[PDB]
Amino acid sequence: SQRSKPASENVYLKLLVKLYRFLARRTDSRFNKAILKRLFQSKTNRPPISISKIAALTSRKSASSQNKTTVVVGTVTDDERMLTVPKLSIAALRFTKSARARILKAGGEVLTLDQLALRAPTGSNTVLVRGKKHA
Amino acid sequence: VNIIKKRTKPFKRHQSDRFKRVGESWRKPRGIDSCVRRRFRGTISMPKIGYGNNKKTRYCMPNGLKAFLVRNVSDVELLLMHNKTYAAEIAGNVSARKRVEIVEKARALGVKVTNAGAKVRSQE
Amino acid sequence: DSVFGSTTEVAQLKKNYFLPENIISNADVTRLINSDEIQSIVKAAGPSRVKR
Amino acid sequence: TVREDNGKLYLYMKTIERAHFPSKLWQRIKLSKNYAKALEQIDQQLLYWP
Amino acid sequence: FIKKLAANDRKTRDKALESLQRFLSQKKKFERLDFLKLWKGLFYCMWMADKPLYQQKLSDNLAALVPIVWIDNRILFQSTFWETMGREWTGIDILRTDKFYLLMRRFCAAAFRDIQTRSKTALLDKVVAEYNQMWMDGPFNTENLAFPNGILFHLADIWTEELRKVYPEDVPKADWYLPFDSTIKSSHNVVLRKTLPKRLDRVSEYTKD
Amino acid sequence: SIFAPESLLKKTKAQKQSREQIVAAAAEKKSARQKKREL
Amino acid sequence: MKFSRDVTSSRRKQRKAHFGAPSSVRRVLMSAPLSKELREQYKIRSLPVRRDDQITVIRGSNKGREGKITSVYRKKFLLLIERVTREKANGASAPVGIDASKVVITKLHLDKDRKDLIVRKGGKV
RNA sequence: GUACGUGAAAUUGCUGAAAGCAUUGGAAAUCAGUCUUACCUGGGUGAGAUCAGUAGUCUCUCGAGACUAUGCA
RNA sequence: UUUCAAUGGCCCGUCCACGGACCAAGGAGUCUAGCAUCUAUGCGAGUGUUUGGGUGAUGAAAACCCAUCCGCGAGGUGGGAACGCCCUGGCGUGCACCAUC
RNA sequence: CUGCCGAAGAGCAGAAACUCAGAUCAGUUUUAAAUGAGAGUU
RNA sequence: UUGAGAAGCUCAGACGAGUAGGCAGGCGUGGAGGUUUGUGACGAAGCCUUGGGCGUGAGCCUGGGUCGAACAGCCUCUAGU
């Protein structure tokens, strides 16, 4: 909730913060500095993002390699208004039960921010999206 | 390092001497006309952070050790690796049976005991 | 396994209940930090406690 | 860890692979009364440790 | 065997290993999921290995188990090992990675030794090409991003060292480094591509097919 | 016969690699500083 | 652990009930163990005390003493025993009372009611 | 010792000593703790054990602890 | 600790006045319902078991479970975080957000 | 209890969010640029 | 080089009045849960003390005297604090 550490008392979010403190300072990457900053944010500063948004944001120009993992420091909720879900690869703090089932069953895979770090420790080939803060 | 104390006197409460109803524990003077709070000359001092002692020699008795309160024999065995850094102190509520057992154990451990002569006699 | 269910399969003795999902996958963060994946791309570390 | 028992010192070791068996969690070796040999024993039993 | 291989008693686990030689030496086609199930038992046989002297004799025993397998499903046995190790590598803890690093080192040399053994019966280039194809849809697959890079850095580090050990005198001409070249040429993870050449000790002396 | 840990072998390669460049930027830094001192 | 919501575990109620117990209830509250031989021949562990019972003092300053219970002082829950007394300043022998649980019965004063009580309470005269 | 568990302060008497808020020190009174016995090295004499070009038992997992003999290089 | 010496030292609170003989004990932002923001937590196009029912052999006013409802909810331009490819900069992709059609 | 910030006598004080030496400012001075400071905003 | 309570350790520089008002960290009391293989008739608690010690402080530890039955540290909970 602040600039120096999280206000959460969850140990696993502190463990994520402990990992990304390392990347933030032992890499030149600006991706790892942003992730550490967004891990200190509050619930309302990390608005949820949806499956439909993620497919929509990573579309149109999706003729590219599309190995790009989508990363959100937040929750990936579900959008049942869309019927077919593409093949996606998302690393998020949380996936809802139906969001995670749709990404897996019809498509690719779901990650955690520590699984991303072992895949892209510098944030290479990542789409660091955000949720709308419209409340 | 030597155990330097910036101050040795207690910070007596203002007018604790005038009245027996007024204790000598420190209370910040909440008054808005208080001369002593205004830090005039001769007015008694007030606890400031600058009197705070060196972090390296904080909590250290004059002999450079730190008091470690001990209730039984198991406690003195914790100070095995810190006998140059800590001194055992037997609690006031430990009986004279245990005090003897605490002191005898701590003697082999090379631990200083601050009150090893309490509640006991010598026979030799 | 019937009382609590799985994280993917439901509990039999609780309706529609799934075990909570975790924020991290492998909770050993020192395993993540000190892995060959991350220690192969980090810039060379400066000293520990540094001289004056 | 090194701990005393009946005037004799032992080296106690535990590994992660015996973490769920409290009875068999720690193994014990008896260190020599010879100080130099006892130091050699700790190096020999704890090699490639941190 | 599968439940016994992951027992809480080493004596029980060991007796399943000695009984596994007869099971693997069968001259019948083993389905891929059958080897997936077996390697989950074998993974926890080594996951539970206690002492470094034991957990390095066990790696020798597991690697020495490759030539026992039937020739027709010997490639399936190894490909399932590298797939059962890719998915489970991230869940290993820091105090258990060094016994599995030796396990992959023993299984990399088993692959090179099996190529050497089959190079006498049939021409080497077919044997290497068949093994290279195993690497293509395995650890060195570009289409999947789930495979760990900590294993791939390990294989790059040990590739030439195990090759030299298998042929002490001199190795023949073959596509020994084909999985690495095709990976760096087309990998979708830039960290792998940028640093794999820095770790691989590829020598141009013996690589021209 | 306890083989050295594999992670220890990987660290030594990195430490050796780091020590190569630190030693490499020693004689040049000494010379460049020495010529700077004359300048 | 008690499981009955008919019985109270309240200390206030137990203490009130003990000290405000009537003389008939106090008759059971003052009970003494039988000696080993009486315990192993009458098959009864303990009986309420009575006048003219032969007892041995088991605990206290008067440990080891014996005598017959001259009277039972039920108001103060005390027993009085022959020759187990204390000399006052003037020379009087003021008796000292002992708790019924701190003595042991070594010879019972067998009335007909005790024998009926013995057989009723799993005993064999 | 019923003006009765403990028995505070305000307060009163007697005896003793001194005198007629803070800073810093003097005088008087008092007090804290304060170490020697160890380290190394050499030899003599015996002792044993984790020693034996040594034999057995129990519990764990080849050897790891606990022992009981026998010897004292 | 007491006292002496040199130095400094005008009674405290309250708003001149008002309270103060001394000491002990008691003595004043509390609980509850509503609302709003912020933080944490769980789930998330949903969400909320505790009106009640089931059940609870160790205390059974708990904990556990849940039917039917019900509440509340329900396209381009520029800048731009981050990323890839290059020979500082250029090129491509461009979240949040703000001016723009 | 200690610490930190700190007025007034819409403005003055902070908190989140963003945008930032590749930015604008100033209780200042020269001329008809000098110098100090990272600047702002809802 | 062992100096990861990573909430730790370590380097540097600047700064220090303060009413209203804002922020943070701590000290204490009665009761609750857990914990200390906790303390206690070889003396708990309380009280007294020109005995000693620690903390800038709130306060805590202790020696001696008195006393005679219960008490406390640490992690959370709570309030007629």
mmCIF file with all atom_site columns, C-alpha atoms in Angstrom, chain A residues 2-123:
data_model
loop_
_atom_site.group_PDB
_atom_site.id
_atom_site.type_symbol
_atom_site.label_atom_id
_atom_site.label_alt_id
_atom_site.label_comp_id
_atom_site.label_asym_id
_atom_site.label_entity_id
_atom_site.label_seq_id
_atom_site.pdbx_PDB_ins_code
_atom_site.Cartn_x
_atom_site.Cartn_y
_atom_site.Cartn_z
_atom_site.occupancy
_atom_site.B_iso_or_equiv
_atom_site.pdbx_formal_charge
_atom_site.auth_seq_id
_atom_site.auth_comp_id
_atom_site.auth_asym_id
_atom_site.auth_atom_id
_atom_site.pdbx_PDB_model_num
ATOM 1   C CA . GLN A 1 2   ? 3.093   2.199   0.152   1.00 0.00 ? 2   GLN A CA 1
ATOM 2   C CA . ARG A 1 3   ? 6.455   2.778   -1.514  1.00 0.00 ? 3   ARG A CA 1
ATOM 3   C CA . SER A 1 4   ? 8.794   0.663   0.647   1.00 0.00 ? 4   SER A CA 1
ATOM 4   C CA . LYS A 1 5   ? 6.962   -2.637  1.212   1.00 0.00 ? 5   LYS A CA 1
ATOM 5   C CA . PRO A 1 6   ? 3.488   -4.180  0.952   1.00 0.00 ? 6   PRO A CA 1
ATOM 6   C CA . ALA A 1 7   ? 0.843   -3.566  3.581   1.00 0.00 ? 7   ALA A CA 1
ATOM 7   C CA . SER A 1 8   ? -0.380  -7.128  3.146   1.00 0.00 ? 8   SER A CA 1
ATOM 8   C CA . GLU A 1 9   ? 0.491   -9.622  5.858   1.00 0.00 ? 9   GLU A CA 1
ATOM 9   C CA . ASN A 1 10  ? 0.378   -12.572 3.444   1.00 0.00 ? 10  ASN A CA 1
ATOM 10  C CA . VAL A 1 11  ? 3.718   -14.384 3.585   1.00 0.00 ? 11  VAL A CA 1
ATOM 11  C CA . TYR A 1 12  ? 3.578   -15.559 -0.041  1.00 0.00 ? 12  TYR A CA 1
ATOM 12  C CA . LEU A 1 13  ? 3.207   -12.003 -1.326  1.00 0.00 ? 13  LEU A CA 1
ATOM 13  C CA . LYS A 1 14  ? 6.182   -11.092 0.851   1.00 0.00 ? 14  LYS A CA 1
ATOM 14  C CA . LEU A 1 15  ? 8.044   -14.041 -0.675  1.00 0.00 ? 15  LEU A CA 1
ATOM 15  C CA . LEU A 1 16  ? 7.225   -12.702 -4.133  1.00 0.00 ? 16  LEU A CA 1
ATOM 16  C CA . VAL A 1 17  ? 8.439   -9.295  -2.957  1.00 0.00 ? 17  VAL A CA 1
ATOM 17  C CA . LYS A 1 18  ? 11.632  -10.914 -1.651  1.00 0.00 ? 18  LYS A CA 1
ATOM 18  C CA . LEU A 1 19  ? 12.317  -12.444 -5.080  1.00 0.00 ? 19  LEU A CA 1
ATOM 19  C CA . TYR A 1 20  ? 11.576  -9.317  -7.101  1.00 0.00 ? 20  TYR A CA 1
ATOM 20  C CA . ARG A 1 21  ? 13.645  -7.174  -4.772  1.00 0.00 ? 21  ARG A CA 1
ATOM 21  C CA . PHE A 1 22  ? 16.554  -9.257  -6.054  1.00 0.00 ? 22  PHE A CA 1
ATOM 22  C CA . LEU A 1 23  ? 15.737  -8.933  -9.709  1.00 0.00 ? 23  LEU A CA 1
ATOM 23  C CA . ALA A 1 24  ? 15.013  -5.228  -9.333  1.00 0.00 ? 24  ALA A CA 1
ATOM 24  C CA . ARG A 1 25  ? 18.558  -4.537  -8.124  1.00 0.00 ? 25  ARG A CA 1
ATOM 25  C CA . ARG A 1 26  ? 20.666  -7.312  -9.690  1.00 0.00 ? 26  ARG A CA 1
ATOM 26  C CA . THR A 1 27  ? 19.342  -6.716  -13.212 1.00 0.00 ? 27  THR A CA 1
ATOM 27  C CA . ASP A 1 28  ? 19.221  -3.684  -15.461 1.00 0.00 ? 28  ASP A CA 1
ATOM 28  C CA . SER A 1 29  ? 15.649  -4.589  -16.398 1.00 0.00 ? 29  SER A CA 1
ATOM 29  C CA . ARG A 1 30  ? 12.920  -1.977  -16.092 1.00 0.00 ? 30  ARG A CA 1
ATOM 30  C CA . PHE A 1 31  ? 10.361  -4.792  -16.084 1.00 0.00 ? 31  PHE A CA 1
ATOM 31  C CA . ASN A 1 32  ? 11.595  -6.111  -12.744 1.00 0.00 ? 32  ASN A CA 1
ATOM 32  C CA . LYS A 1 33  ? 11.559  -2.618  -11.239 1.00 0.00 ? 33  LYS A CA 1
ATOM 33  C CA . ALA A 1 34  ? 7.945   -2.137  -12.316 1.00 0.00 ? 34  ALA A CA 1
ATOM 34  C CA . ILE A 1 35  ? 6.819   -5.509  -10.958 1.00 0.00 ? 35  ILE A CA 1
ATOM 35  C CA . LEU A 1 36  ? 8.374   -4.749  -7.569  1.00 0.00 ? 36  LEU A CA 1
ATOM 36  C CA . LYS A 1 37  ? 6.655   -1.350  -7.530  1.00 0.00 ? 37  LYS A CA 1
ATOM 37  C CA . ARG A 1 38  ? 3.286   -2.878  -8.450  1.00 0.00 ? 38  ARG A CA 1
ATOM 38  C CA . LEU A 1 39  ? 3.684   -5.533  -5.742  1.00 0.00 ? 39  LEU A CA 1
ATOM 39  C CA . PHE A 1 40  ? 3.667   -2.752  -3.128  1.00 0.00 ? 40  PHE A CA 1
ATOM 40  C CA . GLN A 1 41  ? 0.318   -1.472  -4.383  1.00 0.00 ? 41  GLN A CA 1
ATOM 41  C CA . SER A 1 42  ? -3.022  -1.851  -2.673  1.00 0.00 ? 42  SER A CA 1
ATOM 42  C CA . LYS A 1 43  ? -6.070  -3.789  -3.822  1.00 0.00 ? 43  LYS A CA 1
ATOM 43  C CA . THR A 1 44  ? -7.706  -0.806  -5.532  1.00 0.00 ? 44  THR A CA 1
ATOM 44  C CA . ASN A 1 45  ? -4.424  0.192   -7.173  1.00 0.00 ? 45  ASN A CA 1
ATOM 45  C CA . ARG A 1 46  ? -4.304  -3.326  -8.673  1.00 0.00 ? 46  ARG A CA 1
ATOM 46  C CA . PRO A 1 47  ? -7.689  -3.499  -10.386 1.00 0.00 ? 47  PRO A CA 1
ATOM 47  C CA . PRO A 1 48  ? -8.602  -6.874  -11.858 1.00 0.00 ? 48  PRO A CA 1
ATOM 48  C CA . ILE A 1 49  ? -8.165  -7.652  -15.526 1.00 0.00 ? 49  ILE A CA 1
ATOM 49  C CA . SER A 1 50  ? -10.276 -10.052 -17.553 1.00 0.00 ? 50  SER A CA 1
ATOM 50  C CA . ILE A 1 51  ? -9.802  -12.855 -20.046 1.00 0.00 ? 51  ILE A CA 1
ATOM 51  C CA . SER A 1 52  ? -11.677 -10.924 -22.735 1.00 0.00 ? 52  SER A CA 1
ATOM 52  C CA . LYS A 1 53  ? -9.484  -7.866  -22.240 1.00 0.00 ? 53  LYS A CA 1
ATOM 53  C CA . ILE A 1 54  ? -6.291  -9.921  -22.449 1.00 0.00 ? 54  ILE A CA 1
ATOM 54  C CA . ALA A 1 55  ? -7.399  -11.629 -25.650 1.00 0.00 ? 55  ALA A CA 1
ATOM 55  C CA . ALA A 1 56  ? -8.548  -8.283  -27.061 1.00 0.00 ? 56  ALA A CA 1
ATOM 56  C CA . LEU A 1 57  ? -5.366  -6.414  -26.110 1.00 0.00 ? 57  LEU A CA 1
ATOM 57  C CA . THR A 1 58  ? -3.194  -9.173  -27.601 1.00 0.00 ? 58  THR A CA 1
ATOM 58  C CA . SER A 1 59  ? -5.019  -9.492  -30.918 1.00 0.00 ? 59  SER A CA 1
ATOM 59  C CA . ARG A 1 60  ? -5.154  -7.873  -34.372 1.00 0.00 ? 60  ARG A CA 1
ATOM 60  C CA . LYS A 1 61  ? -1.352  -7.812  -34.631 1.00 0.00 ? 61  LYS A CA 1
ATOM 61  C CA . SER A 1 62  ? -1.239  -11.357 -33.169 1.00 0.00 ? 62  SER A CA 1
ATOM 62  C CA . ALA A 1 63  ? 0.393   -12.509 -36.425 1.00 0.00 ? 63  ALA A CA 1
ATOM 63  C CA . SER A 1 64  ? 3.732   -11.979 -34.635 1.00 0.00 ? 64  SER A CA 1
ATOM 64  C CA . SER A 1 65  ? 5.610   -14.673 -32.705 1.00 0.00 ? 65  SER A CA 1
ATOM 65  C CA . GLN A 1 66  ? 3.079   -14.282 -29.861 1.00 0.00 ? 66  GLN A CA 1
ATOM 66  C CA . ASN A 1 67  ? 5.425   -16.088 -27.488 1.00 0.00 ? 67  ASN A CA 1
ATOM 67  C CA . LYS A 1 68  ? 4.882   -12.930 -25.450 1.00 0.00 ? 68  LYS A CA 1
ATOM 68  C CA . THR A 1 69  ? 3.642   -13.928 -22.015 1.00 0.00 ? 69  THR A CA 1
ATOM 69  C CA . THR A 1 70  ? 0.987   -11.573 -20.678 1.00 0.00 ? 70  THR A CA 1
ATOM 70  C CA . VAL A 1 71  ? 1.817   -10.347 -17.178 1.00 0.00 ? 71  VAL A CA 1
ATOM 71  C CA . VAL A 1 72  ? -0.521  -8.599  -14.749 1.00 0.00 ? 72  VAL A CA 1
ATOM 72  C CA . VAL A 1 73  ? 0.229   -7.859  -11.093 1.00 0.00 ? 73  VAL A CA 1
ATOM 73  C CA . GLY A 1 74  ? -3.396  -8.469  -10.232 1.00 0.00 ? 74  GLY A CA 1
ATOM 74  C CA . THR A 1 75  ? -6.253  -10.917 -10.660 1.00 0.00 ? 75  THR A CA 1
ATOM 75  C CA . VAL A 1 76  ? -7.246  -12.345 -14.036 1.00 0.00 ? 76  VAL A CA 1
ATOM 76  C CA . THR A 1 77  ? -11.010 -12.681 -13.781 1.00 0.00 ? 77  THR A CA 1
ATOM 77  C CA . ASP A 1 78  ? -13.327 -14.379 -16.252 1.00 0.00 ? 78  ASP A CA 1
ATOM 78  C CA . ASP A 1 79  ? -15.543 -12.942 -18.972 1.00 0.00 ? 79  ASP A CA 1
ATOM 79  C CA . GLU A 1 80  ? -18.314 -15.398 -19.799 1.00 0.00 ? 80  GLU A CA 1
ATOM 80  C CA . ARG A 1 81  ? -19.744 -13.032 -22.428 1.00 0.00 ? 81  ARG A CA 1
ATOM 81  C CA . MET A 1 82  ? -17.115 -14.362 -24.844 1.00 0.00 ? 82  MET A CA 1
ATOM 82  C CA . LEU A 1 83  ? -17.623 -17.942 -25.966 1.00 0.00 ? 83  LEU A CA 1
ATOM 83  C CA . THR A 1 84  ? -14.317 -19.056 -27.511 1.00 0.00 ? 84  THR A CA 1
ATOM 84  C CA . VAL A 1 85  ? -11.132 -18.240 -25.594 1.00 0.00 ? 85  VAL A CA 1
ATOM 85  C CA . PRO A 1 86  ? -7.903  -18.068 -27.639 1.00 0.00 ? 86  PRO A CA 1
ATOM 86  C CA . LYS A 1 87  ? -4.590  -19.684 -26.745 1.00 0.00 ? 87  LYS A CA 1
ATOM 87  C CA . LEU A 1 88  ? -3.124  -17.422 -24.062 1.00 0.00 ? 88  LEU A CA 1
ATOM 88  C CA . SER A 1 89  ? -0.153  -17.523 -21.693 1.00 0.00 ? 89  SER A CA 1
ATOM 89  C CA . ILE A 1 90  ? -0.728  -15.322 -18.642 1.00 0.00 ? 90  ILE A CA 1
ATOM 90  C CA . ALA A 1 91  ? 1.280   -14.770 -15.465 1.00 0.00 ? 91  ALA A CA 1
ATOM 91  C CA . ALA A 1 92  ? -0.856  -13.140 -12.784 1.00 0.00 ? 92  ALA A CA 1
ATOM 92  C CA . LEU A 1 93  ? -1.090  -12.921 -9.029  1.00 0.00 ? 93  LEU A CA 1
ATOM 93  C CA . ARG A 1 94  ? -4.394  -14.781 -9.048  1.00 0.00 ? 94  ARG A CA 1
ATOM 94  C CA . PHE A 1 95  ? -6.666  -16.563 -11.480 1.00 0.00 ? 95  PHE A CA 1
ATOM 95  C CA . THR A 1 96  ? -10.265 -17.196 -10.602 1.00 0.00 ? 96  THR A CA 1
ATOM 96  C CA . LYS A 1 97  ? -11.372 -20.820 -10.819 1.00 0.00 ? 97  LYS A CA 1
ATOM 97  C CA . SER A 1 98  ? -13.272 -20.299 -14.063 1.00 0.00 ? 98  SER A CA 1
ATOM 98  C CA . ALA A 1 99  ? -10.626 -18.002 -15.549 1.00 0.00 ? 99  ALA A CA 1
ATOM 99  C CA . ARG A 1 100 ? -7.934  -20.614 -14.950 1.00 0.00 ? 100 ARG A CA 1
ATOM 100 C CA . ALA A 1 101 ? -10.076 -23.442 -16.332 1.00 0.00 ? 101 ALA A CA 1
ATOM 101 C CA . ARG A 1 102 ? -10.841 -21.566 -19.553 1.00 0.00 ? 102 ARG A CA 1
ATOM 102 C CA . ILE A 1 103 ? -7.240  -20.566 -20.262 1.00 0.00 ? 103 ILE A CA 1
ATOM 103 C CA . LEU A 1 104 ? -6.107  -24.147 -19.719 1.00 0.00 ? 104 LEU A CA 1
ATOM 104 C CA . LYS A 1 105 ? -8.888  -26.169 -21.346 1.00 0.00 ? 105 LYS A CA 1
ATOM 105 C CA . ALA A 1 106 ? -9.263  -24.012 -24.461 1.00 0.00 ? 106 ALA A CA 1
ATOM 106 C CA . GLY A 1 107 ? -5.733  -22.774 -24.946 1.00 0.00 ? 107 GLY A CA 1
ATOM 107 C CA . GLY A 1 108 ? -2.360  -22.432 -23.304 1.00 0.00 ? 108 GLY A CA 1
ATOM 108 C CA . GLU A 1 109 ? -1.223  -22.041 -19.723 1.00 0.00 ? 109 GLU A CA 1
ATOM 109 C CA . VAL A 1 110 ? -1.425  -19.942 -16.559 1.00 0.00 ? 110 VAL A CA 1
ATOM 110 C CA . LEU A 1 111 ? 1.633   -18.883 -14.576 1.00 0.00 ? 111 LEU A CA 1
ATOM 111 C CA . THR A 1 112 ? 2.598   -17.284 -11.297 1.00 0.00 ? 112 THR A CA 1
ATOM 112 C CA . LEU A 1 113 ? 4.960   -14.336 -11.071 1.00 0.00 ? 113 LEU A CA 1
ATOM 113 C CA . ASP A 1 114 ? 7.680   -16.681 -9.794  1.00 0.00 ? 114 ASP A CA 1
ATOM 114 C CA . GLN A 1 115 ? 7.116   -19.069 -12.697 1.00 0.00 ? 115 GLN A CA 1
ATOM 115 C CA . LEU A 1 116 ? 7.508   -16.097 -15.028 1.00 0.00 ? 116 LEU A CA 1
ATOM 116 C CA . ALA A 1 117 ? 10.734  -15.054 -13.304 1.00 0.00 ? 117 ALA A CA 1
ATOM 117 C CA . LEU A 1 118 ? 12.315  -18.415 -14.062 1.00 0.00 ? 118 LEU A CA 1
ATOM 118 C CA . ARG A 1 119 ? 11.097  -18.123 -17.676 1.00 0.00 ? 119 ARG A CA 1
ATOM 119 C CA . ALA A 1 120 ? 11.758  -14.406 -18.295 1.00 0.00 ? 120 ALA A CA 1
ATOM 120 C CA . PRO A 1 121 ? 13.961  -13.063 -15.478 1.00 0.00 ? 121 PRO A CA 1
ATOM 121 C CA . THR A 1 122 ? 14.367  -9.783  -17.401 1.00 0.00 ? 122 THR A CA 1
ATOM 122 C CA . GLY A 1 123 ? 10.760  -9.602  -18.561 1.00 0.00 ? 123 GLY A CA 1
#
